[PDB]
């Protein structure tokens, strides 16, 4: 809260890319990863 001032160099819009592993395998992954894959990506929700 109440910060001073900061403006470091920043890159432009990044190019698209495939997603990380875990969500690409709704079956076989752990329940904790499956919940995260459904909460963030939206996959492995109704198994």
From Swiss-Prot:
Recorded GO MF terms: chitin binding
Subcellular location: Cytoplasmic granule
UniProt keyword list: Amidation, Antibiotic, Antimicrobial, Chitin-binding, Disulfide bond, Fungicide, Signal
GO CC annotations on file: cytoplasm
Entry superkingdom: Eukaryota
Record-listed Leucine amide modification sites: 47
Gene Ontology biological process terms, A to Z: defense response to bacterium; defense response to fungus; killing of cells of another organism
Cysteine pairs bridged by disulfides in the record: 23-37, 26-44, 38-45
Family assignment from sequence similarity: Belongs to the penaeidin family.
Function recorded in the entry: Antibacterial and antifungal activity. Presents chitin-binding activity.
Name this protein carries in UniProt: Penaeidin-4d
Organism for this UniProt entry: Penaeus setiferus (Atlantic white shrimp)
Origin organism lineage: Eukaryota, Metazoa, Ecdysozoa, Arthropoda, Crustacea
